[PDB]
Write a structure and sequence with these properties.
Neutral Protease, domain 2; Elastase, domain 1; 18% strand; 2 domains; Protease; binds calcium ion; 316 residues; binds zinc ion; binds the ligand CC(C)C[C@H](NP(=O)(O)CNC(=O)OCc1ccccc1)C(=O)NCCC(C)(C)C; hydrolase/hydrolase inhibitor; alpha+beta
C-alpha cells in the first residue's frame, strides 16, 4: 500500500527483540519498502486461503504472541534478501526485485512451510513437531530459495532433480544462517523443531544419516514417497556441500575444505548458469566442477575439492 516508511519493534518466535521495517497509512503494515519492490507479510488467520490480509497493527509495536511468527517471517525475509543482494548481486528471487510475500498462521497445527509458486507460507506447527516455522532463519531462507531455484534452474520437484532442488534450499538456508551469524550451524530447522527435545533438528548437512537420510549415493532412496525422496536424497548433496566447505574424510575419501563463501559462489553459479529443470546428481557434479573452473581455474584446489566431495558421496 501507499504510505511512509516506518520502523516498528517486536519480538520473534524465540522471544528475541528486533526492529522491523513497516509502512504507515492509518495502520502500521508489515511492508518493508527498503528492499527491492518491497517485502510484504500477511495474516492467513488459521485459514488456507492465501495470502490473507496484509498485516496491520495499530501502534507499530509487535510484542503479542500472535505477532511473533509475522515478525520473524518479515525480518528473516529481509536478511535473506540482503544475503542474495550483497553476496551474489541478485535482486530478489527473480533478479528484478520482485515483491516478496509471506503468509503466517497458515491453517491449524500445520507442521510445514512452503513456496506455493508465488509466495512463502508458514504453519504455526502443532507445538510438538514444530513451533511457528518462521522462527528459523534457515527455514525462511530455505523457502525463499525455492523461489530463486524456480526462476533459475527450474529443477523439477521429484526424484534427483527434486533432491537437488531441496539441497539447494538447505545449502542457501544454511549460508543465510551463517550470514546473520546468530548460533549458525550445518543443521536444518533446529530453532523451531521439537521444542520438547534439545539438540536435534529436521536434517543435518554435516551428518545426514543422524536423521535417517543417506550420505552416499549407494544409499539413495528409490521409492515413490516424498516425490521420490526429495527431502531424503537431498542428504547426499547436502553432505557433498558440507565437505566442499568444511572438508573431511568420508567413506575413506579425503576432501580439503575451501570454506563457506566459496561453496556459496560455486553453487550459486551452478544453479544460475548450468543446472536445468531435469538435472540429475551426475549433472550437478559436472555443473559444480564447471562453476569452480570458471571462478578459480581448472588446476585450482577449489576444483579438486569439488571432485573429491562428489567422489566421497559416490556421485560420478
Ligand atoms: C526447512 C523445513 C522446516 C521446511 C521444508 N518445507 P519445503 O519448502 O521443502 C515443502 N515444500 C513443498 O512441498 O513444495 C511443493 C509445492 C509446490 C508447489 C506449490 C506448493 C507446494 C521441508 O523440509 N519440509 C518437509 C518437512 C517434513 C514433512 C519432512 C516434516
Ligand atoms: Ca501492536
Ligand atoms: Ca542455528
Ligand atoms: Ca540451522
Ligand atoms: Ca528440538
Ligand atoms: Zn524445501
Amino acid at each position: 500500500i501507499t504510505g511512509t516508511s516506518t520502523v516498528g519493534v517486536g519480538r520473534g518466535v524465540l522471544g528475541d527483540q528486533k526492529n522491523i521495517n513497516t509502512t504507515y497509512s492509518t495502520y502500521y503494515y508489515l511492508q518493508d519498502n527498503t528492499r527491492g519492490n518491497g517485502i510484504f507479510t500477511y495474516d492467513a488467520k488459521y485459514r488456507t486461503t492465501l495470502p490473507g490480509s496484509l498485516w496491520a497493527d495499530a501502534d507499530n509495536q509487535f510484542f503479542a504472541s500472535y505477532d511473533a511468527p509475522a515478525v520473524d517471517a518479515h525480518y528473516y525475509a529481509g536478511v535473506t534478501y540482503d544475503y542474495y543482494k550483497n553476496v551474489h548481486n541478485r535482486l530478489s528471487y527473480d533478479g528484478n526485485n520482485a515483491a516478496i510475500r509471506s503468509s503466517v498462521h497458515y491453517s491449524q497445527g500445520y507442521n510445514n512451510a512452503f513456496w506455493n509458486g508465488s509466495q512463502m507460507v508458514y504453519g504455526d506447527g502443532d507445538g510438538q513437531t514444530f513451533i511457528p516455522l518462521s522462527g528459523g532463519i534457515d527455514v525462511v531462507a530455505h523457502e525463499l530459495t525455492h523461489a530463486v531455484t524456480d526462476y533459475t534452474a527450474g529443477l523439477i520437484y521429484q526424484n534427483e532433480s527434486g533432491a537437488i532442488n531441496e539441497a539447494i534450499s538447505d545449502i542457501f538456508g544454511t549460508l543465510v544462517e551463517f550470514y546473520a551469524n546468530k548460533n549458525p550451524d550445518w543443521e536444518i530447522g533446529e530453532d523451531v523443531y521439537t521444542p520438547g527435545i534439545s539438540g536435534d533438528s529436521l536434517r543435518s548437512m554435516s551428518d545426514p544419516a543422524k536423521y535417517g537420510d543417506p550420505d552416499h549415493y549407494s544409499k539413495r532412496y528409490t521409492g515413490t514417497q516424498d516425490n521420490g525422496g526429495v527431502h531424503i536424497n537431498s542428504g547426499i548433496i547436502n553432505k557433498a556441500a558440507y565437505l566442499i566447505s568444511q572438508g573431511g574424510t568420508h567413506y575413506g575419501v579425503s576432501v580439503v575444505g575451501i570454506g563457506r563463501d566459496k561453496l556459496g559462489k560455486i553453487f550459486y553459479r551452478a544453479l544460475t548458469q548450468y543446472l536445468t529443470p531435469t538435472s540429475n546428481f551426475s549433472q550437478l557434479r559436472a555443473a559444480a566442477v564447471q562453476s569452480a573452473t570458471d571462478l578459480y581455474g581448472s588446476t585450482s584446489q577449489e576444483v579438486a575439492s569439488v571432485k573429491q566431495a562428489f567422489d566421497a558421496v559416490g556421485v560420478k
